[PDB]
């Protein structure tokens, strides 16, 4: 899959975004992974959910609203494993996103903007990607 | 050119490393560029010169010696232009590296390890690359 990876998308309660991929360097090099849920197809559009991994160090989550970054949430939780493929599953719950890493609940982020505002998902920085899916099974 | 880009290399006084490329996102997204001069072909080897651009924000330079990062040099100088191709030229002078951006002297970094210790150059993070060259014209 090409990285940066972009897909038009819609989200609501019950939606799951599944990403399978792979850092491009060992953790000692501090590769990054970024997943952004955008309100428009344009990359300068607002970001309802920003998820940024500095592999082996930290994760930051935030939103970008009317062009400006808001209060970041910083986590030191690091379930990702050096040199390994990862499977990332972001579920849209009524009150928050829930982020699973290799099947383990690892982060959550309460909705600041309704998920129905999302029109695009971008996955980029220092990863390769073998799978991307947005589920569309629920009303 | 594939990114991450790796080339075996040797450097001495008079050597020039010329990199031509292009951020993968606008500056608002804060794409990065990293150029590392390594002592071995392995990515965990020491880094004689680390050059890391956070486009539109800062540049940091450092060395990684026996596995540990040393004193970083942080610069707010930012000659790179939003959305534009750049031409980066790193010259090996007797006392320092000199970094030109689009023909303009922009950064320098005094040698901490002799440049003759370099065996590999890696260029990676959020850029595309159209040209890479190491000059080999001087004794």
Q: Which residues of A touch B43 (CB under 8 A)?
A: 25-26, 28-29
The upper half-sphere exposure of residue B25, i.e. CA atoms within 13 Å in the direction of its Cβ, equals: 26
CB nearest A43 (choices: B4, B29, B126): B29
Give the nearest chain B residue to A32 (CA atoms).
B125
Q: Structure tokens of B115? A: 């440049």
Q: How far apart are CA A29 and CA B35, in angstroms?
A: 12
Structure determined via = X-ray
CB B15 within 8 A of CB B111: no
CATH topology assigned to domain A5-134 = Jelly Rolls (2.60.120)
As to burial, measured by CB atoms within 10 angstroms (0-12 exposed, 13-18 middle, 19+ buried), residue B138 is: exposed
By three-state DSSP, how is residue B12 classified?
A: coil
Contact assignment for B24 to A124 by CB distance below 8 Å: yes
Chain A: residues touching B (Cβ < 8 Å): 4, 24-26, 28-29, 32, 43-44, 67, 124-126
**Cα gap A25→B43, rounded to integer Å:** 8
Strands (E), chain A: 5-8, 16-23, 32-38, 47-54, 58-65, 68-69, 73-75, 86-92, 96-101, 104-110, 120-125, 127-134
Beta carbons within 8 Å of A47's beta carbon, 6+ residues apart = A36, A37, A38, A39, A62, A63, A64
Residue B2's alpha-carbon distances to A108, A125, B16, B54, in angstroms, are 35, 14, 21, 20
> Scanning every residue of chain B, which has its alpha carbon at the shortest distance from the alpha carbon of A126?
B125
User: B26 contacts in A (CB within 8 Å)?
Assistant: 43-44
**Chain A interface test: which of B72, B125, B128 (most A C-beta within 10 Å):** B125
Do the chains contact at B43 and A24, CB–CB below 8 Å? no
Check if the beta carbon of residue A33 is closer than 8 Å to that of residue A20: no
Which residue numbers of B have CB closer than 8 Å to A's CBs?
A: 4, 24-26, 28-29, 32, 43-44, 67, 124-126
Selection from A89, A106, A101, A97 nearest residue A49 by Cα: A97
Q: How far apart are CA B127 and CA B123, in angstroms?
A: 9
Domain ranges of chain A: 5-134
Q: In the A/B pair of chains, how many CB contacts fall below 8 A?
A: 30
Q: Which residue reads 């002592």 in tokens?
A: B39
Please say whether the dihedral angle defined by the alpha carbons of residues B35, B37, B40 and B41, taken in this order, is positive or negative: positive
Q: Say if strands B32-38 and B47-54 run parallel, antiparallel, or are unpaired.
A: antiparallel
Which chain A residues are closer than 8 Å to B28 by Cβ? 43-44, 67
Chain B CB contacts of A124 below 8 Å: 24-25, 126
User: Given phi > 0 = left and psi -120 to 50 = alpha, else beta, which region is A66?
Assistant: left
């Amino acid at each position: 899959l090409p990285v940066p990876y972009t897909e038009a998308a819609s989200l609501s309660t019950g939606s799951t975004v599944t990403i399978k991929g792979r850092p491009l360097a060992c953790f000692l090099a501090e590769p990054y992974l970024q997943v952004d849920f955008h309100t428009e197809m344009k990359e300068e559009s607002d970001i309802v959910f920003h998820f940024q991994v500095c592999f082996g160090r930290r994760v930051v989550m935030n939103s970008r609203e009317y062009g400006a970054w808001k209060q970041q949430v910083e986590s030191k939780n690091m379930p990702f494993q050096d040199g390994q493929e990862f499977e990332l599953s972001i579920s849209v719950l009524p009150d928050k996103y829930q982020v699973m890493v290799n099947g383990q609940s690892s982060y959550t982020f309460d909705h600041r903007i309704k998920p129905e505002a999302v029109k695009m998902v971008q996955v980029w920085r220092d990863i390769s990607l073998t799978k991307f899916n947005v589920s569309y099974l629920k009303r």
